[PDB]
Coordinates of N, CA and C in Angstrom, one line a residue:
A282 N -77.7 0.8 -12.8 CA -78.2 2.1 -12.4 C -79.5 2.0 -11.6
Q283 N -79.8 3.1 -10.9 CA -81.1 3.0 -10.1 C -81.8 4.3 -10.1
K284 N -83.1 4.3 -9.7 CA -83.9 5.5 -9.6 C -84.9 5.3 -8.5
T285 N -85.2 6.4 -7.7 CA -86.2 6.3 -6.6 C -87.5 6.8 -7.0
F286 N -88.6 6.2 -6.6 CA -90.0 6.7 -6.9 C -90.8 6.7 -5.5
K287 N -91.9 7.3 -5.6 CA -92.9 7.5 -4.6 C -94.2 6.7 -5.2
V288 N -94.8 5.8 -4.4 CA -95.9 5.1 -4.8 C -97.2 6.0 -4.4
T289 N -98.0 6.1 -5.4 CA -99.2 7.0 -5.4 C -100.5 6.3 -5.6
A290 N -100.4 5.0 -6.0 CA -101.7 4.2 -6.2 C -102.3 4.0 -4.8
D291 N -103.7 4.2 -4.8 CA -104.4 3.9 -3.5 C -104.2 2.6 -2.9
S292 N -104.3 1.5 -3.8 CA -104.2 0.2 -3.2 C -102.8 -0.2 -3.1
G293 N -101.8 0.7 -3.4 CA -100.4 0.2 -3.2 C -100.1 -0.9 -4.3
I294 N -99.1 -1.6 -4.1 CA -98.7 -2.7 -5.0 C -99.2 -4.1 -4.6
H295 N -100.4 -4.5 -5.0 CA -100.8 -5.8 -4.8 C -100.5 -6.6 -6.1
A296 N -101.1 -7.8 -6.2 CA -100.8 -8.7 -7.3 C -100.9 -8.1 -8.7
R297 N -102.0 -7.4 -9.0 CA -102.1 -6.9 -10.4 C -101.0 -6.0 -10.8
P298 N -100.8 -4.9 -10.1 CA -99.7 -3.9 -10.5 C -98.3 -4.6 -10.5
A299 N -98.2 -5.5 -9.5 CA -96.9 -6.2 -9.4 C -96.7 -7.0 -10.7
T300 N -97.8 -7.5 -11.2 CA -97.6 -8.3 -12.5 C -97.2 -7.5 -13.6
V301 N -97.8 -6.3 -13.7 CA -97.4 -5.3 -14.7 C -95.9 -5.0 -14.7
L302 N -95.4 -4.7 -13.5 CA -93.9 -4.4 -13.3 C -93.1 -5.6 -13.8
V303 N -93.5 -6.7 -13.3 CA -92.6 -7.9 -13.6 C -92.6 -8.2 -15.1
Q304 N -93.8 -8.1 -15.8 CA -93.9 -8.4 -17.2 C -92.9 -7.5 -18.0
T305 N -92.8 -6.2 -17.5 CA -91.8 -5.3 -18.2 C -90.4 -5.7 -17.9
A306 N -90.2 -5.9 -16.6 CA -88.8 -6.2 -16.2 C -88.2 -7.5 -16.9
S307 N -89.1 -8.4 -17.1 CA -89.0 -9.7 -17.7 C -88.4 -9.7 -19.1
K308 N -88.6 -8.5 -19.7 CA -88.1 -8.3 -21.1 C -86.7 -8.0 -21.3
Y309 N -85.9 -7.9 -20.1 CA -84.6 -7.4 -20.2 C -83.6 -8.4 -19.7
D310 N -82.4 -8.2 -20.2 CA -81.3 -9.2 -19.8 C -80.8 -8.8 -18.4
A311 N -80.8 -7.5 -18.1 CA -80.2 -7.0 -16.8 C -80.9 -7.7 -15.6
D312 N -80.1 -7.7 -14.5 CA -80.8 -8.1 -13.2 C -81.6 -6.8 -12.8
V313 N -82.9 -7.0 -12.4 CA -83.7 -5.9 -12.0 C -84.2 -6.1 -10.6
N314 N -84.0 -5.2 -9.7 CA -84.3 -5.3 -8.3 C -85.2 -4.0 -7.8
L315 N -86.0 -4.3 -6.8 CA -86.9 -3.4 -6.2 C -86.5 -3.4 -4.7
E316 N -86.2 -2.2 -4.2 CA -85.8 -2.1 -2.8 C -86.9 -1.2 -2.1
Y317 N -87.3 -1.7 -0.9 CA -88.2 -0.9 -0.1 C -87.8 -1.2 1.4
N318 N -87.6 0.0 1.9 CA -87.4 0.0 3.4 C -86.3 -0.9 3.7
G319 N -85.3 -1.0 2.9 CA -84.1 -1.9 3.4 C -84.2 -3.3 3.0
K320 N -85.4 -3.7 2.3 CA -85.5 -5.0 1.8 C -85.4 -5.0 0.3
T321 N -84.7 -5.9 -0.3 CA -84.4 -6.0 -1.7 C -85.0 -7.3 -2.4
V322 N -85.8 -7.1 -3.5 CA -86.3 -8.3 -4.1 C -86.2 -8.2 -5.6
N323 N -86.3 -9.5 -6.2 CA -86.1 -9.6 -7.7 C -87.4 -9.0 -8.3
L324 N -87.1 -8.0 -9.2 CA -88.3 -7.5 -9.9 C -88.8 -8.4 -11.0
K325 N -88.3 -9.6 -11.3 CA -88.8 -10.6 -12.2 C -89.6 -11.6 -11.5
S326 N -90.0 -11.4 -10.2 CA -90.8 -12.4 -9.4 C -92.0 -11.6 -8.8
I327 N -93.1 -12.2 -9.2 CA -94.4 -11.6 -8.7 C -94.6 -11.7 -7.2
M328 N -94.3 -12.9 -6.7 CA -94.5 -13.2 -5.3 C -93.5 -12.4 -4.5
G329 N -92.3 -12.2 -4.9 CA -91.3 -11.4 -4.4 C -91.8 -9.9 -4.1
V330 N -92.3 -9.3 -5.2 CA -92.8 -7.9 -5.1 C -94.1 -7.8 -4.2
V331 N -95.0 -8.8 -4.2 CA -96.2 -8.7 -3.4 C -95.9 -8.9 -1.9
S332 N -94.9 -9.7 -1.6 CA -94.5 -10.0 -0.2 C -94.1 -8.7 0.5
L333 N -93.8 -7.6 -0.2 CA -93.4 -6.4 0.5 C -94.5 -5.6 1.1
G334 N -95.7 -5.7 0.6 CA -97.0 -5.1 1.2 C -96.7 -3.5 1.0
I335 N -96.2 -3.2 -0.1 CA -95.9 -1.8 -0.5 C -97.2 -1.0 -0.6
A336 N -97.2 0.1 0.2 CA -98.5 0.9 0.1 C -98.3 2.3 -0.3
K337 N -99.4 3.0 -0.6 CA -99.4 4.4 -1.0 C -98.6 5.2 -0.1
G338 N -97.8 6.1 -0.7 CA -96.9 7.0 0.1 C -95.5 6.4 0.2
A339 N -95.3 5.1 0.0 CA -94.0 4.4 0.0 C -93.0 5.0 -0.9
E340 N -91.7 5.0 -0.4 CA -90.6 5.4 -1.4 C -89.9 4.1 -1.8
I341 N -89.6 3.9 -3.0 CA -89.0 2.7 -3.5 C -87.9 3.0 -4.5
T342 N -86.9 2.0 -4.5 CA -85.8 2.3 -5.5 C -85.9 1.1 -6.4
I343 N -85.7 1.4 -7.7 CA -85.6 0.3 -8.7 C -84.3 0.4 -9.3
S344 N -83.6 -0.7 -9.3 CA -82.3 -0.7 -10.0 C -82.3 -1.8 -11.1
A345 N -81.4 -1.6 -12.1 CA -81.1 -2.6 -13.1 C -79.6 -2.8 -13.3
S346 N -79.1 -4.0 -13.5 CA -77.7 -4.1 -13.8 C -77.4 -5.1 -14.9
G347 N -76.9 -4.6 -16.0 CA -76.6 -5.4 -17.2 C -76.5 -4.6 -18.4
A348 N -76.6 -5.4 -19.5 CA -76.5 -4.8 -20.9 C -77.6 -3.8 -21.3
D349 N -78.8 -4.0 -20.8 CA -79.9 -3.1 -21.2 C -80.5 -2.4 -20.0
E350 N -79.5 -2.2 -19.0 CA -80.0 -1.6 -17.8 C -80.6 -0.2 -17.9
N351 N -80.1 0.6 -18.9 CA -80.6 2.0 -18.9 C -82.0 2.0 -19.7
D352 N -82.1 1.1 -20.6 CA -83.5 1.1 -21.3 C -84.4 0.4 -20.3
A353 N -83.9 -0.7 -19.6 CA -84.8 -1.3 -18.6 C -85.4 -0.3 -17.6
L354 N -84.6 0.6 -17.2 CA -85.0 1.6 -16.2 C -86.1 2.6 -16.7
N355 N -85.9 2.9 -17.9 CA -86.7 3.9 -18.6 C -88.1 3.2 -18.8
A356 N -88.0 2.0 -19.3 CA -89.3 1.2 -19.5 C -90.1 1.1 -18.2
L357 N -89.4 0.8 -17.1 CA -90.1 0.7 -15.8 C -90.7 2.0 -15.3
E358 N -89.9 3.0 -15.5 CA -90.4 4.4 -15.1 C -91.7 4.7 -15.9
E359 N -91.6 4.5 -17.2 CA -92.9 4.8 -18.0 C -94.1 3.9 -17.6
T360 N -93.9 2.7 -17.4 CA -94.8 1.6 -16.9 C -95.6 2.1 -15.7
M361 N -94.7 2.6 -14.8 CA -95.1 3.1 -13.5 C -95.9 4.4 -13.6
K362 N -95.4 5.3 -14.5 CA -96.1 6.5 -14.7 C -97.4 6.4 -15.4
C363 N -97.5 5.6 -16.5 CA -98.7 5.4 -17.3 C -99.8 4.8 -16.5
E364 N -99.5 3.9 -15.6 CA -100.4 3.2 -14.8 C -100.8 3.9 -13.5
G365 N -100.2 5.1 -13.2 CA -100.6 5.8 -12.0 C -100.1 5.2 -10.7
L366 N -99.2 4.2 -10.9 CA -98.6 3.5 -9.8 C -97.7 4.4 -8.9
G367 N -96.9 5.2 -9.7 CA -95.8 5.9 -8.8 C -95.1 6.9 -9.8
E368 N -94.4 7.7 -9.1 CA -93.7 8.8 -9.9 C -92.4 9.3 -9.1

């Protein structure tokens, strides 16, 4: 499944926020991906997510595919909202 968000954090997704998203994604069996502007990366890789240079105002899609895909997605959505990263 997938869900789209808008990035609202001023400094966008640098290493710190990227680490938060990966630590959550890392807890699930599903494959978890982050798409931005037509580029797709593993959400279980910090370097992968930082390489995008995602900034404030960006639209991103997160998908999960597997046995815990729907709880994986919920987790990430909450992670994202609690941290002020995106909504």
